[PDB]
Design a protein around this ligand. Sequence first.
Ligand SMILES: C=NC1=N[C@@H]2[C@@H](O)[C@H](O[C@@H]3O[C@H](CO)[C@@H](O[C@@H]4O[C@H](CO)[C@@H](O)[C@@H](O)[C@H]4NC(C)=O)[C@@H](O)[C@H]3NC(C)=O)[C@@H](CO)[C@@H]2O1
Length: 365
Amino acid sequence: AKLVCYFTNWAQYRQGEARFLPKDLDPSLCTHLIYAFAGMTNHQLSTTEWNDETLYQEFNGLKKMNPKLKTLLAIGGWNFGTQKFTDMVATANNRQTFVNSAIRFLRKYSFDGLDLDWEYPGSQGSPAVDKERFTTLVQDLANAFQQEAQTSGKERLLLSAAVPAGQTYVDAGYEVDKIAQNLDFVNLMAYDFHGSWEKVTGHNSPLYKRQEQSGAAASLNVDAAVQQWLQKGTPASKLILGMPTYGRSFTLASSSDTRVGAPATGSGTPGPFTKEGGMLAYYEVCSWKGATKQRIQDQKVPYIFRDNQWVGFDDVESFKTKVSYLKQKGLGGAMVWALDLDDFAGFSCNQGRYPLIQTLRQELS
Ligand SMILES: C=NC1=N[C@@H]2[C@@H](O)[C@H](O[C@@H]3O[C@H](CO)[C@@H](O[C@@H]4O[C@H](CO)[C@@H](O)[C@@H](O)[C@H]4NC(C)=O)[C@@H](O)[C@H]3NC(C)=O)[C@@H](CO)[C@@H]2O1
């Protein structure tokens, strides 16, 4: 089974014990490590931090300690946008310029593959035409990757993509059945189902829906996301189930109504280390004494509150539940975002180093 874990090249700027660099990485924790994120300049793959080349080397150098490990470079991301993607896949000359740079870039830095993270083709400013242009991009990469392997005589470069769970987005830009044939594995983003962008508290990653949910609202859970990608044609073994080492917070309109579905006046106080209201690292949810942990029985995930602060998150338990759920589904494995937000150095949760992902590795193996 696969355990695809994401490293992020901006965690390095967090303060104190929250700072994360390749040295905080465990070469054996995951089967595949994906480096987030690499951008694009003139239709080509490029760095995004002043020290990506140094990081790239330490990142991939980890394979000297674990030759079984596979590393990939992720291009895109939420904040990346759609512009540069839509423009790069618009002309053959551009697609080919990108592909050739991807290959040369990945090989130069010792990456084993590329993880496409276009959020998302077919929306957010992306013309519905990009739905089929994406598919072409995938085929182009796959084809070039296959050809190169034979000429260079090296392990063929791997091709993956981070994909949305929403029904609306899959229909809008993904030719599921067709891309699945060319993607070595699909990284399903089964989270962000609920967030502070809503007026009511909801869980970031509920495994199942709540009895009181119907219609489109009943699809906002992992299972729906999974059943969906399978039905549309994804071999269960290529579908990797994503899980978050972060949770989503809300500020309660009143601390008297703390249930899931209660009135939220907006995002929760930013985390002292993550400093991005509405989300929190697992290790930030740990430093909470005097809080109250619940359990959304129907969705098999927890959440905690203290005064006007409510946060739905994942713990060692829900992670075990989820690892167990995917097994039953015959999925290819688990995906986690991000190594970065777990208690990677056992400095806050008192459960050791990488409490959550370690749970994943042990449960999966
Ligand atoms: C598995 N792939 C995958 N891709 C999606 C990610 O985009 C997303 O995580 C979010 O990624 C954006 C960047 O695209 C991050 O933006 C960063 O936010 C911090 C504040 O927290 C800010 O200071 C900047 O460093 C900013 N950097 C950039 C390059 O914009 C975060 O918003 C990040 N969010 C979380 C909760 O990690 C994940 C999860 O939705 C998806 O998974």
